Amino acid sequence: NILDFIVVSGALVAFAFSGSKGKDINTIKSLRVLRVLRPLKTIKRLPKLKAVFDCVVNSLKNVLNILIVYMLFMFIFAVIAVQLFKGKFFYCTDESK
Amino acid sequence: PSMRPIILVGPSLKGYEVTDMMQKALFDFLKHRFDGRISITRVTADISLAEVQSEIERIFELARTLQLVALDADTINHPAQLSKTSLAPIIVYIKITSPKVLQRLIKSRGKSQSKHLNVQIAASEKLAQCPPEMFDIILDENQLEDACEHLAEYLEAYWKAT
Amino acid sequence: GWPMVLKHSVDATYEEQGPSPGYRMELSIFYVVYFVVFPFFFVNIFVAL
Amino acid sequence: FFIYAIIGMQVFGNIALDDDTSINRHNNFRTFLQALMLLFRSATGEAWHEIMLSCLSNQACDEQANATECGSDFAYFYFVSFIFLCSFLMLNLFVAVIMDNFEYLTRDSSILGPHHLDEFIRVWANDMFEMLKHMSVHFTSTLMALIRTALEITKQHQCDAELRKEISVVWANLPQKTLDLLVPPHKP
Amino acid sequence: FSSFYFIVLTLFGNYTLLNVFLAIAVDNLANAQELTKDEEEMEEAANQKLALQKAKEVAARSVWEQRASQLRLQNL
Amino acid sequence: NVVRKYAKRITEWPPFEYMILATIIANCIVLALEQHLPDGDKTPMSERLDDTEPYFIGIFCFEAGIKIIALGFVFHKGSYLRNGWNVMDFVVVLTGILATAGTDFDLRTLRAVRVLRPLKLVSGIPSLQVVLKSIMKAMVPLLQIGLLLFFAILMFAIIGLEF
Amino acid sequence: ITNFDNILFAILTVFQCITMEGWTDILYNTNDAAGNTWNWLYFIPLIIIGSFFMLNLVLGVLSGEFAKERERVENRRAFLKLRRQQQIERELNGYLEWIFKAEEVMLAEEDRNSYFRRKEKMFRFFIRRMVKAQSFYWVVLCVVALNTLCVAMVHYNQPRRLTTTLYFAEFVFLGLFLTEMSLKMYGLGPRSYFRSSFNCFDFGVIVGSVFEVVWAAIKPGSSFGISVLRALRLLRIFKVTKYWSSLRNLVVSLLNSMKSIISLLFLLFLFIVVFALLGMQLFGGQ
Numbered sequence A: 001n002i003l004d005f006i007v008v009s010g011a012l013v014a015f016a017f018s019g020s021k022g023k024d025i026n027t028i029k030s031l032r033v034l035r036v037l038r039p040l041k042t043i044k045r046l047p048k049l050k051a052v053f054d055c056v057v058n059s060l061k062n063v064l065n066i067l068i069v070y071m072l073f074m075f076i077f078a079v080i081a082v083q084l085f086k087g088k089f090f091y092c093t094d095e096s097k
Numbered sequence B: 001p002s003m004r005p006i007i008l009v010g011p012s013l014k015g016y017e018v019t020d021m022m023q024k025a026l027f028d029f030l031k032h033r034f035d036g037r038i039s040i041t042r043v044t045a046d047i048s049l050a051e052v053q054s055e056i057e058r059i060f061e062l063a064r065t066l067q068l069v070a071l072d073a074d075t076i077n078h079p080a081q082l083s084k085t086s087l088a089p090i091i092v093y094i095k096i097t098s099p100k101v102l103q104r105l106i107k108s109r110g111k112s113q114s115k116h117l118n119v120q121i122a123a124s125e126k127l128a129q130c131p132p133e134m135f136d137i138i139l140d141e142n143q144l145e146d147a148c149e150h151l152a153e154y155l156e157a158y159w160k161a162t
Numbered sequence C: 001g002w003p004m005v006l007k008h009s010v011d012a013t014y015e016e017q018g019p020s021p022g023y024r025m026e027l028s029i030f031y032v033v034y035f036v037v038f039p040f041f042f043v044n045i046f047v048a049l
Numbered sequence D: 001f002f003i004y005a006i007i008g009m010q011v012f013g014n015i016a017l018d019d020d021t022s023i024n025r026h027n028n029f030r031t032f033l034q035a036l037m038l039l040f041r042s043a044t045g046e047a048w049h050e051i052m053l054s055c056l057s058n059q060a061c062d063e064q065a066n067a068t069e070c071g072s073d074f075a076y077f078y079f080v081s082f083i084f085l086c087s088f089l090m091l092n093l094f095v096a097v098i099m100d101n102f103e104y105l106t107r108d109s110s111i112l113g114p115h116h117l118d119e120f121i122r123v124w125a126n127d128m129f130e131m132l133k134h135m136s137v138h139f140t141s142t143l144m145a146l147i148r149t150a151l152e153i154t155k156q157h158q159c160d161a162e163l164r165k166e167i168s169v170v171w172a173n174l175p176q177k178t179l180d181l182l183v184p185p186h187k188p
Numbered sequence E: 001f002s003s004f005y006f007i008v009l010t011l012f013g014n015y016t017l018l019n020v021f022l023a024i025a026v027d028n029l030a031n032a033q034e035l036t037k038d039e040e041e042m043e044e045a046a047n048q049k050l051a052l053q054k055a056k057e058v059a060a061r062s063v064w065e066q067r068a069s070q071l072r073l074q075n076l
Numbered sequence F: 001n002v003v004r005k006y007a008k009r010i011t012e013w014p015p016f017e018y019m020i021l022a023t024i025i026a027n028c029i030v031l032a033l034e035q036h037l038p039d040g041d042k043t044p045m046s047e048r049l050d051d052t053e054p055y056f057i058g059i060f061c062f063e064a065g066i067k068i069i070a071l072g073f074v075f076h077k078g079s080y081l082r083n084g085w086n087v088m089d090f091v092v093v094l095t096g097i098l099a100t101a102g103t104d105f106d107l108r109t110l111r112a113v114r115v116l117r118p119l120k121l122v123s124g125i126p127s128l129q130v131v132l133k134s135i136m137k138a139m140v141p142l143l144q145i146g147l148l149l150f151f152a153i154l155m156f157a158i159i160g161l162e163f
Numbered sequence G: 001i002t003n004f005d006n007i008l009f010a011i012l013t014v015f016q017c018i019t020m021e022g023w024t025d026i027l028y029n030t031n032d033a034a035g036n037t038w039n040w041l042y043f044i045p046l047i048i049i050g051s052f053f054m055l056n057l058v059l060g061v062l063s064g065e066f067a068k069e070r071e072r073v074e075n076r077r078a079f080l081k082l083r084r085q086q087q088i089e090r091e092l093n094g095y096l097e098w099i100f101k102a103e104e105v106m107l108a109e110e111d112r113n114s115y116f117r118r119k120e121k122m123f124r125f126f127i128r129r130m131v132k133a134q135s136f137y138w139v140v141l142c143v144v145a146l147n148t149l150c151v152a153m154v155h156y157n158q159p160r161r162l163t164t165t166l167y168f169a170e171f172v173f174l175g176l177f178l179t180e181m182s183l184k185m186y187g188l189g190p191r192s193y194f195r196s197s198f199n200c201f202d203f204g205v206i207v208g209s210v211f212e213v214v215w216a217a218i219k220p221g222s223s224f225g226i227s228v229l230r231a232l233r234l235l236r237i238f239k240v241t242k243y244w245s246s247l248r249n250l251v252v253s254l255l256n257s258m259k260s261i262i263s264l265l266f267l268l269f270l271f272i273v274v275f276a277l278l279g280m281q282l283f284g285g286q
């Protein structure tokens, strides 16, 4: 219901800001892109699509314990890499300088 | 007696630091948990063969006050060793169900008794073949707190009974 | 595009300097350990879970 | 794929095609089909980081589009989250397919299954002795008897009682007596 | 005809690699799953027996795992 | 004959096996120490690496001789050439011997088999043998997947020819 | 080389598309030679059937083989032996805590009535009870977490006040962790300190950090990045969570079969070496 409300609210605010003045294009375009959640409505309607979504979420929660370990390990490797190659990835278009 | 006295037995031979310390920790908990309700004494005369008889009447006059009496015996390593005498304490069994943890524990407990491991394990096993009904209370817990609360709850049941 | 990153990593002289081919060539062991851990081990860990 | 294609169209749709970049005549966002092909390309891991770097902020914008600055730094989240989500969902599809088949994948030749049923259908063409040599009220009672001999649930009366219990449990959809009629043939 | 080196190295190196690392992951993760399962089952079993004896004196599963049990029974 | 067949069974005393191991790692390091230059050029140290070969081929031949005289050849149903790993060692040592024939076509393809010498590490450590059998046991069911992949490649290659 | 001019060329390019390497360049070439309307029907089905479907079949067959092999007689025997070892160690730890409490109450009783022996032993027991208390757990995790914040904010061209701050904070944290190791080892005793593999990890990491400090004192330029591995002690937050058993038993299985893993990463090394020497034979210097 929150998703439905935010979709509707985005559409209405996008309509309201239609002043044809060009004051803000980034905001109105973002409110347009917010429409893309529109097909995401049919997953609450179809029970079997919702069942598939729940199975995917269950698998994600099943691997949530190792995902934390994974992001901790990759943070450690990222920090080691920063200690190694920080500032060294500079170059010239002229190989001689 | 008016009350059945408390007797600890089951890990291994008394007088050895393993059984002595396990029983002493349980005994200290039983002491300072029930402050003003249990009597503490150390017994060094062989009740199982009943100077020998000089202390049984001492047990009665502690057991005659409707209070729990703790028996720190130094020669009981068997429940049936006392079965012939009419003293009849509660045979509390501090049981450990696997001899391998016993052996690794004897290794862990210092250096002196490492050479006394074999006979102590043998007598512990000897007590292990004894049937459970010979004992009053079974202490199968590995944690100190769980075994302590089990024994304390049965003691509360006995207290409410008498 | 990991071989390109490996080439940049090995060919890195110092802070605020340009490359030098074949420099610091022992910095491939950072990219051999990383593939052993994340692409090879952890990926298959998730697939098994 | 639909959600991500539409977001790509509506955000990175007006980047000026340049054959020296990764937004080309071949790999643009300008139509639903081209965007969907781009996402399929990224799913299989074809220089998707190059597409990200060519979809970043401050790119040359298409001549026939009104806007002057096109592309956005939303590309980092867009592409990283697409790789993560696509890989995860395809992993879940793979695992669902695998576990829908797990009794086949872990099959044993000695233990029976649909293969024995199909081969007994082939036996239709006495020959039962030959197949007993070759093994691991006309063609249904025999099937029940062979299944009983393969897997085991007076002991014969106990097996009949178990068959009756199972038939009662799994009574067919709108059948008068389908498994019940087999029970008279499955009893002996 | 020098491309057989690369065909062989990319066939026998993207599936042997997968075989080895997936075997490691599957074996170790299944061992972990069974260890936690068994220790929990033993925990409630011991707790129930302890409650029964103490009161006496004072008076689903995944497809992998069900299939593992079936294989255990069959091999037994 | 047979009076000596009894003695070289005792020769496999474990330091002998570890010495064969040592020469295998030595040969692996010698192989890894080579460098290749385009048009017949060669490094000043590659000559020394080329001179160190006869010691290795001699040690391998001596080991093969011990294993061939202490054990059988093919006859007793248990022997050298009836072990899967001993066949690879025989191929390596025999081909190294044959590479010293002084001909033209040998060097390009008879020097290449010399890369199978690291596999003598597996051939000499039975734990690595059992681990290798464990690896390869789970890739026999992949033969049908290989046939399927080849069939798909054939169909799509025929379509690609057509179009 | 990537053309369909022949059955063998077609087989080679189809096989290259199967591996999903350069399969678009081959597609983008047929979009120029011919129209781009119908070419996707050759490649998208090809990719789906050769790379996605075949990977699915390989995963299924491999997982089925793993499930079948795992429940054999000898593998089941090994797993039950591992389970027995775990149970025995758990019970032994419980009984050791029993005996330690006995030691504590006894020593208190004899002190209630060689003097420096008693002093040092009660000090040891006080430390050993402190290093296991829940507050020591939280203070050590707070120090570890405050350490990773000091290494996650090292970036290129950082202010010079930050560089010296982190340089001295590294020494402060090394001193704090050395103090923590000293207290823990004196309390539990060295024979028992190395009973937990994670303490072996911490000891090795701080030794490596000291080595890195020395090596940077000698040659300032290089940095081995071993002082960062102290972030792995943040991984104990799972202790106060219902998911300790799963991760702990995963590590137990890994460390138990750490010999069958090293002898797997070695056979891979041997095969990579064989293919390297073969490639040196074939394409060496050309």
Ligand SMILES: CC(C)CCC[C@@H](C)[C@H]1CC[C@H]2[C@@H]3CC=C4C[C@@H](OC(=O)CCC(=O)O)CC[C@]4(C)[C@H]3CC[C@]12C
Binding pocket: G145, G148, G149, G152, G153, G155, G156, G157
């Ligand atoms: C605290 C523990 C649990 C680890 C969590 C790590 C992150 C949540 C925090 C730790 C400190 C933060 C960093 C501190 C300062 C930097 C440098 C900063 O770069 C700049 O200020 C601009 C560069 C310039 O203009 O010179 C960019 C963000 C970043 C990486 C921050 C990113 C987020 C960080 C890594």
Ligand SMILES: CCCCCCCCCCCCCCCC
Binding pocket: C025, C026, C028, C029, C032, C036, G265, G268, G269, G272
């Ligand atoms: C001049 C010395 C540079 C060292 C280069 C080392 C390269 C390592 C490549 C991969 C070797 C180990 C792979 C084994 C993975 C199972």
Ligand SMILES: CCCCCCCCCCCCCCCC
Binding pocket: A073, A076, A080, C026, C027, C029, C030, C033, G223, G224, G225
């Ligand atoms: C020659 C100095 C630098 C050496 C290059 C590699 C340094 C890092 C090696 C691996 C460190 C991380 C180990 C994995 C544990 C998370």
Ligand SMILES: CCCCCCCCCCCCCCCC
Binding pocket: D057, D071, D072, D073, D074, D077
């Ligand atoms: C014109 C765009 C310039 C940069 C502004 C956007 C910065 C990044 C935004 C990322 C939003 C991700 C979260 C939204 C969906 C959960």
Ligand SMILES: CCCCCCCCCCCCCCCC
Binding pocket: D073, D074, D076, D077, D080, D081
């Ligand atoms: C180069 C200038 C800085 C641009 C920063 C813009 C915001 C970046 C958004 C990053 C979103 C995080 C991706 C995590 C995906 C799971």
Ligand SMILES: CCCCCCCCCCCCCCCC
Binding pocket: A003, D003, D007, D077, D078, D081
């Ligand atoms: C940057 C593009 C974002 C696209 C979003 C796709 C996934 C969004 C989350 C799924 C919807 C969750 C709603 C709550 C359901 C319990």
Ligand SMILES: CCCCCCCCCCCCCCCC
Binding pocket: E001, E002, E003, E004, E005, E008, G282
């Ligand atoms: C100047 C030589 C021209 C001909 C070269 C053709 C290639 C040589 C054969 C390569 C075959 C590699 C076999 C690898 C098997 C694992």
Ligand SMILES: CCCCCCCCCCCCCCCC
Binding pocket: F159, F163, G034, G038, G039, G041, G042, G045
């Ligand atoms: C005028 C035709 C130009 C080239 C068109 C190529 C289309 C290829 C035919 C379709 C291949 C289907 C694969 C079979 C499995 C789905």
Ligand SMILES: [Ca+2]
Binding pocket: C001, D045, D046, D047, G020, G021, G022
């Ligand atoms: Ca690629």
